[PDB]
Amino acid sequence: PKKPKEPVQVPKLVIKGGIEVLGVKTGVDSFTEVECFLNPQMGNPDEHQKGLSKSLAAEKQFTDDSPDKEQLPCYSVARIPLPNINEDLTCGNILMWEAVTVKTEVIGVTAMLNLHSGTQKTHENGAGKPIQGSNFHFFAVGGEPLELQGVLANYRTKYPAQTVTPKNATVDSQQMNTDHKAVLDKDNAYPVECWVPDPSKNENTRYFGTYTGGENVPPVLHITNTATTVLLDEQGVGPLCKADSLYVSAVDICGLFTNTSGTQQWKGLPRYFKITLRKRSVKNPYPISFLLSDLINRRTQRVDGQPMIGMSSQVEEVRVYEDTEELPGDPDMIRYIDEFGQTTTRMQ
Amino acid sequence: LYVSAVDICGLFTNTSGTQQWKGLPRYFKITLRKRSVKNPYPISFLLSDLIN
């Protein structure tokens, strides 16, 4: 009549569970899907105002601009540990976790539909004025910590106690100040208004973000479980997780909640991630020698005595020989090497 | 090789009536041999560590 087709062959799930599961001793061709997430850090003023920044400050003289950490929203970051895969790895075949794909989404957008709770009125018998205004959403997934680069307006700003800000603000910090290279290594620390992923350098993490600035720009966000993002680089290699760790970072200032009082304060939302990891074969680019050098100089004899290097080297001369040659006439001759060939010249 | 022990043999009751624990030392004679095993931590691990 009609034959019930043989089913399609799809990937065999070996095990589902929490992060620990990651530790199953799987083969070279397995992979996993890690579903984490991050809460946002807008400042979180009281213990009831989670997802909010402290009521925002308006006009302040450039000089006297000392904001509070509770008003400064910061990048949210986290590190997911991955089980070392070389555990029973064969010869010098070394494997690393590669991030291939990510699916992310902002969690809870529908919540901005409570136009009734601390809301300033739209007008007369209107509802509440919904959250709107400048917004910034960004995230990144990488095999190392997110590398920053700080830049600000008003370098003369007095940055609160518990925050990491650019070191030694100059005027050029209002524009490209190279001394402001850093790294997102602490959650709720680096305030968004001071940093941005340093393009010159994040070579092992991908990031994306968009600033949409305006006094009342309406936020627009979609929520869908059908979209995927590829992290593969130009060679088809996504972030390699050097230290068996996965770095996820994100930021989502949806905009400004405007209080009945008329005070404004930033609103943020947690963000979801779904990273798909695989087992990537790579080569150790370095030499054993250089590796052992660690243990050795990190643990043997260290000595402080007269300089044999630097501009004060008490080494006056070094000559090197290999093979032989017919007895040369100028014994003070000089053999050297430029950036490639051997030069032979008299001193004078 | 690690060795640990405990030997409260009981309570010494002083003339006073006060009591206090008594212990004795313990002896061990451990017999060790050379056992072949799978290298648990290879060179691969070295790099992974350095990088970490």
User: Are the Cβ atoms of A243 and B51 closer than 8 angstroms?
Assistant: yes
Alpha-carbon gap, residue B25 to A335, rounded angstroms: 74
Q: Within chain A, how many helices (H) and strands (E) appear?
A: 1, 14
Q: Shortest CA distance to A235 belongs to which of A266, A203, A212?
A: A203
Alpha-carbon gap, residue A290 to B50, rounded angstroms: 10
Distance from CA of A239 to the nearest CA of B (A): 15
Q: Please name the member of B43, B48, B50 whose beta carbon is closest to the beta carbon of A84.
A: B48
| Residue A314, amino acid | Q
Q: Shortest CA distance to A231 belongs to which of A100, A97, A35?
A: A100
From chain B, the residues in CB contact with A94 under 8 A are 44, 47-48
Number of inter-chain CB pairs under 8 A, A vs B: 33
From chain B, the residues in CB contact with A294 under 8 A are 50
Which two three-digit tokens encode residue A100? Answer: 């291939």
Q: Within chain B, how many helices (H) and strands (E) appear?
A: 1, 2
From chain B, the residues in CB contact with A243 under 8 A are 48, 51-52
* CB distance A107 to A126 below 8 Å: no
| Residue A288, amino acid | I
Backbone angles phi, psi at A178, to 5 degrees: -55, -20
| Residue A311, amino acid | M
Residue A274 belongs to what domain range? 1-348
Q: What is the DSSP letter of A301?
A: -
Backbone angles phi, psi at A70, to 5 degrees: -60, -15
Decide the pairing of beta strands A271-282 and A31-38: antiparallel
CA distances A67 to A62, A162, A191, A214, Å, are: 11, 11, 11, 21
Which two three-digit tokens encode residue A46? Answer: 């009281």
User: Are the Cβ atoms of A92 and B46 closer than 8 angstroms?
Assistant: no
Could you tell me how many residues make up chain B? 52
Which two three-digit tokens encode residue A185? Answer: 């290594």
Longest CA pairwise span in chain B (Å): 67
Q: Shortest CA distance to A127 belongs to which of A136, A118, A140, A138?
A: A118
Q: Is A342 helix (H, G, I), strand (E, B) or coil?
A: strand
Alpha-carbon gap, residue A253 to A133, rounded angstroms: 10
* CB distance A291 to A285 below 8 Å: no
Alpha-carbon gap, residue B52 to B47, rounded angstroms: 8
Q: Tell me which H or E stretch contains A291.
A: helix A288-299
User: Are the Cβ atoms of B50 and A243 closer than 8 angstroms?
Assistant: no
Which two three-digit tokens encode residue A122? Answer: 């739209």
Residue A245's CATH number: 2.60.175.10
From chain B, the residues in CB contact with A92 under 8 A are 43-44
DSSP of A221-268, one letter per residue? ----TT--EE---TTS---B-SSSEEEEEEEEEEEEEEBTTS-EEEEE
DSSP of A82-126, one letter per residue? ---SGGG--SS-EEEEEEEEEEEEETTGGGGG--SSSBPBSSTT-
CA Rg, chain B, in Å?
24
| Residue A255, amino acid | G
Structural domain count, chain A? 1
Q: Is A15 helix (H, G, I), strand (E, B) or coil?
A: coil
Which two three-digit tokens encode residue A190? Answer: 């680096």
| Experimental structure resolution, Å | 3.1
* CB distance A139 to A253 below 8 Å: no
